[PDB]
Design an enzyme around this catalytic site. Structure first.
Site, short mmCIF file in Angstrom:
data_model
loop_
_atom_site.label_atom_id
_atom_site.label_comp_id
_atom_site.label_asym_id
_atom_site.label_seq_id
_atom_site.Cartn_x
_atom_site.Cartn_y
_atom_site.Cartn_z
N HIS A 62 0.85 -1.19 0.00
CA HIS A 62 0.00 0.00 0.00
C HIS A 62 0.88 1.23 0.00
O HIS A 62 0.53 2.25 -0.59
CB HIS A 62 -0.86 0.07 1.26
CG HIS A 62 -1.66 -1.16 1.51
ND1 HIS A 62 -2.61 -1.66 0.65
CD2 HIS A 62 -1.63 -2.02 2.57
CE1 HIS A 62 -3.12 -2.77 1.18
NE2 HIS A 62 -2.55 -3.03 2.35
N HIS A 92 5.01 7.10 6.94
CA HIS A 92 4.81 6.64 5.56
C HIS A 92 4.30 7.81 4.71
O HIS A 92 4.05 8.90 5.25
CB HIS A 92 3.78 5.49 5.54
CG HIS A 92 2.39 5.93 6.00
ND1 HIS A 92 2.05 5.79 7.29
CD2 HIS A 92 1.22 6.38 5.35
CE1 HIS A 92 0.75 6.11 7.49
NE2 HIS A 92 0.23 6.47 6.29
N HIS A 94 1.93 9.18 0.90
CA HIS A 94 0.87 8.97 -0.09
C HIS A 94 1.32 9.91 -1.22
O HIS A 94 1.75 11.04 -0.95
CB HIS A 94 -0.50 9.41 0.42
CG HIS A 94 -0.90 8.67 1.68
ND1 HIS A 94 -1.58 7.53 1.57
CD2 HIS A 94 -0.76 8.91 3.04
CE1 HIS A 94 -1.87 7.02 2.80
NE2 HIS A 94 -1.37 7.87 3.71
N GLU A 104 -3.60 13.66 0.64
CA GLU A 104 -4.92 13.23 1.07
C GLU A 104 -5.76 14.44 1.52
O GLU A 104 -6.91 14.63 1.10
CB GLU A 104 -4.76 12.20 2.18
CG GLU A 104 -3.97 10.98 1.72
CD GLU A 104 -4.32 9.73 2.47
OE1 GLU A 104 -4.10 9.70 3.70
OE2 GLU A 104 -4.80 8.75 1.83
N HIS A 117 2.94 11.05 6.75
CA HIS A 117 2.24 10.81 8.01
C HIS A 117 3.14 10.22 9.08
O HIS A 117 3.68 9.12 8.91
CB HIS A 117 1.07 9.83 7.84
CG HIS A 117 -0.07 10.40 7.05
ND1 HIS A 117 -0.90 9.54 6.46
CD2 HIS A 117 -0.50 11.70 6.66
CE1 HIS A 117 -1.83 10.21 5.71
NE2 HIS A 117 -1.58 11.54 5.83
N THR A 196 -6.67 6.68 7.42
CA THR A 196 -7.05 6.87 6.02
C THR A 196 -7.03 5.60 5.19
O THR A 196 -7.35 5.63 4.01
CB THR A 196 -6.21 8.01 5.33
OG1 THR A 196 -4.81 7.70 5.37
CG2 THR A 196 -6.45 9.35 6.04
#
Ligand SMILES: [Zn+2]
EC number: 4.2.1.1
Length: 258
Positions: A62, A92, A94, A104, A117, A196
Site C-alpha cells: 500500500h 509513511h 501517499h 490526502e 504521516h 485513512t
C-alpha cells in the site's frame, strides 16, 4: 476483493468491508481556510525526536513505512491539542501518478504532490493495539510535500527504495533522524478524524502542518518506481495511493495561527 487503491477495490468500495467508511469522523478532509477557526487556547507542538530509533523500511503493498523502536519515551509528541504523551511508531507517504495530485488533505481544494504521516499512539493506553480502539488513541502529524528544491533529510529514504521495490521487501534502516523531514514552522490546523486506510478507525487527532516541505521532482520520481505487487506477479505501479476528501460533517477545524 482485498482492499486497495484500484478502480475495483479502491476508496469507493471500502465501505462494503469497513462500514465505518461512511462514519462521522472520517479522514481526510478539505481544509477551507476561511471556515477554519483560529483557537488561541491551542498550545504549540512539542516534538522530541532526538532519541528516535529507526529500525527498518518496508513496502507493505500500500505504501512504504519506516518503523521505529517505540519501547521507551524516546521520540514523543505532546503539546498542541493533546493531553498526555504520544509515541512515534512509524511514518509513511501517499503520492500521485503526477505532481499535481497525491496528498490526502487538501487546502481550499488544493492538492499537493504528496503527504507524509508520522503516526503516534497514546501511552496511557499501554500499546498501539489498545490505543486504536480509543477515540483519542492516535495522533498523526500530517505534512504536505511541494516540488521545489530538494530536502536533504529525505535523501536517505529516497535512495534505499530501490532495494524494496515490491511488496514484502524489507531493509534495515537504522540511524535515520526524522527531524530532517520537518518544516521550519510548526503552525498547524487540527481536527478529530480517522485512519485513512482500512480499518479506518476513528481514533485519530489530526495535526496538519501549514508549511509544506519542498522536495525535488527528482526525489518524488523515486516514489513512483515502487510496485503494489509481490515479486513474480503482474507488475502494478504504486501510484495514487491516496484516499479523497470525506464529508467534514459536524466538525470544526481549528487553527493554531491567526
Ligand atoms: Zn497515511
Amino acid at each position: 476483493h482485498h482492499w486497495g487503491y484500484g478502480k475495483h477495490n479502491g476508496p469507493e468500495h471500502w465501505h462494503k468491508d469497513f462500514p465505518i467508511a461512511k462514519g462521522e469522523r472520517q479522514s481526510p478532509v478539505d481544509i477551507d481556510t476561511h471556515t477554519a477557526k483560529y483557537d488561541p487556547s491551542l498550545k504549540p507542538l512539542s516534538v522530541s525526536y532526538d532519541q528516535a530509533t529507526s529500525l527498518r523500511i518496508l513496502n507493505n503493498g500500500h505504501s512504504f513505512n519506516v518503523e521505529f523502536d517505540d519501547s521507551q519515551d524516546k521520540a514523543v509528541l505532546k503539546g498542541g491539542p493533546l493531553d498526555g504523551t504520544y509515541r512515534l511508531i512509524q511514518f509513511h507517504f501517499h503520492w500521485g501518478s503526477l505532481d499535481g495530485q497525491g496528498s490526502e488533505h487538501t487546502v481550499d481544494k488544493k492538492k499537493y504532490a504528496a503527504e507524509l504521516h508520522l503516526v503516534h499512539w497514546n501511552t496511557k493506553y499501554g500499546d498501539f493495539g489498545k490505543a486504536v480502539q480509543q477515540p483519542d488513541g492516535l495522533a498523526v502529524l500530517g505534512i504536505f510535500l511541494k516540488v521545489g528544491s530538494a530536502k536533504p533529510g529525505l535523501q536517505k529514504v529516497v535512495d534505499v527504495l530501490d532495494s524494496i521495490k515490491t511488496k514484502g521487501k524489507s531493509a534495515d534502516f537504522t540511524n535515520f533522524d526524522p527531524r530532517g523531514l520537518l518544516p521550519e514552522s510548526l503552525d498547524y490546523w487540527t481536527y478529530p478524524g480517522s485512519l485513512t486506510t482500512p480499518p479506518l478507525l476513528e481514533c485519530v487527532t489530526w495535526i496538519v502542518l501549514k508549511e509544506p516541505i519542498s522536495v525535488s521532482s527528482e526525489q518524488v520520481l523515486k516514489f513512483r518506481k515502487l510496485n503494489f505487487n509481490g515479486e513474480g506477479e503482474p507488475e502494478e505501479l504504486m501510484v495514487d495511493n491516496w484516499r479523497p476528501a470525506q464529508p467534514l460533517k459536524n466538525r470544526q477545524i481549528k487553527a493554531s495561527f491567526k
